[model samples]
Target chain A: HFDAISAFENYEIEKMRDGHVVVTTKVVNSSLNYYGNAHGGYLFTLCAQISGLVVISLGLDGVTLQSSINYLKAGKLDDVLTIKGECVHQGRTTCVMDVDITNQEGRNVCKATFTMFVTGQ
Target chain B: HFDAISAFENYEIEKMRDGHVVVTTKVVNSSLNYYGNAHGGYLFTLCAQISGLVVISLGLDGVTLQSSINYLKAGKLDDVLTIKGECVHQGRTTCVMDVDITNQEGRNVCKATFTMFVTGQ
Candidate 1:
């Protein structure tokens, strides 16, 4: 296990546990496009940062080496967005966190899993 | 201050506190528009839900009074996006949460604040 970390600049950091946290956001024009929706990268950043922060709270600092987002629904601008994650398993040097996405209507927008290297990503 | 609640479903549930939670989301077609970015409503869904969850955790079941999101960047589909929120002030009958949006590359996209009515909107 090494000492590395994901970038932590604009993470919402709403709820923090020994190994988890919750994040939330919204779709605005600046975060939308010609189609009037939030950007994908913006959401991804939310998940990754939240995931990274969640694991880091487990007393082990780490980085997101690999992550994936499975889009289920469209992230809209008129409503609100929500994301939450927690550590599934934490080892001496690595941790696994699961992240989910939802809309204001309570629909599944996306799902993700982050694998922190415990070193860096 | 009163005790109320907003609906909770598919919030991603990344992190949590007794009175706050951070949330995140992604850009998907279902939550987006034909322009290939997340929809505004979907993004708002995320922010609002996360705020509710955070408040609930704080031992207060409250509803969102009036929430507003400011768009700073275009919500798109090509990249991942992020959202995070935290409790600003917790009152017996009211609470405020701060939510932020960012890109995977670390850019400010949007910012929002949710006011849980602690009763109803």
Candidate 2:
């Protein structure tokens, strides 16, 4: 009974290297809102996923503590978005990362900073 | 071409009174992450929607400026969740709101603060 609204194939992780992760996804109809733009949550999820991928690939158990997002532009339906995440700071108890999303048209759609907690293991 | 991916029905605005709003939605599979928990972005979008609904209802032209979210716990799929949004400040050019999301079991799953820009009418 899960609609496209419930699928993981909607988001694709392409690369995780050099403390950076790149993800790509499309602004599908189900992921867009009433305004015909990608839902902020959808964008947020992509950013969050990239951040998580980058953090965990570095060999830490990661848990998101807080995140701040700024919406720059709207993403159109069917547009492919490229999300890039980089770990800016890795501390004893926290990792600060930045994620930027760009549309197929090369416009910055959203930007985010994630503060994640990590176990030193 | 627009799927439920682009629908507003995903977020139901139940009540918007006294500078407060209540939204309800289920954690559908599409809104969950690989961990089977509600995607952080999905939770963020809900908070943003509630904040916008409240600000505009108060007669202001609401535009989101920035939003910060904190993850308190994970939300499970198929769980009905309630999101409560309250305006903490309505100033000349900005409105600040706090949103709390709770599951059917009454556990706080996520909390967010929205800083939105407004134009006086």
Candidate 3:
């Protein structure tokens, strides 16, 4: 998730518009930890990154203040994932968003929520 | 974090007793994400794994119900990390624990909290 160019190469913004965005990635070997499944940190980075973009699209500068994710299932290598993030609320200084990820099978793999304190929106 | 023995190989139980645990890991390059920093997912996995062990040490079968993490700073490759988790409270079915990690520099880099549902004790 940290290699800006490789991350760019791996993930594509399949959809981006006001208030919502969807990013897609093929679960590559690099995305995995030693367990042969997707790494939890990569997932968090994705959540933070995509949600931050959604916030920016809404006209705000985003700072990740707090985030929490519950892992229900692991996404394995070669699995294509759809990460969707939506702005749940926009407060005076914070934006709340919920993210849901589905593996290629369309099974629910993860659910996460985040709060970013933003400026300008 | 998912490979049981590999995770055990990477982490050591620095301390564990009633309601508390301390886990240590050497942040090898394999533990890193593309950004060349310690992976966030590994941090979360470490949290879930150790806190669950602590709960089990307290005589309960633990199931992770929810977990949330906040990143303050990044842990880079080859850094030795110390992760500590403490049981804040053990209720009828839920155990709440807090985890904090410090890099070799002893700077606090990450903080996490978890709640697990237990069946015994």
Give native contacts recovered, as a fraction, per prediction. 0.00, 0.55, 0.29
lDDT of 2 at B72: 91
Query: Is model 2 an incorrect, acceptable, medium or high docking prediction?
Result: acceptable
- Which residue ranges in model 3 land beyond 4 Å of their true spot? A1-64, A70-82, A87-97, A102-109, A116-121, B1-9
Order candidates by TM-score, high to low.
2, 3, 1
Candidate 3 DockQ, CA atoms: 0.19
Output the better candidate (1/2) by lDDT: 2
Across residues A1-121, which tens digit of lDDT does each residue of candidate 1 receive? 1111111222244677887677666555444422344444445555655675676577666645445455556677556667788888876677878888788788987776776667533
- What lDDT score is found at residue B118 in candidate 3? 80
Question: What does candidate 1 score on TM?
Answer: 0.44
Best by lDDT: 2
Candidate 3 chain B: worst 10 consecutive residues by lDDT? B1-10
The runs of at least 3 residues in candidate 1 whose Cα sits more than 4 Å from the true structure, single-residue gaps closed, are A1-12, B1-121
lDDT of each: 0.58, 0.76, 0.71
Q: Rank by DockQ, descending?
A: 2, 3, 1
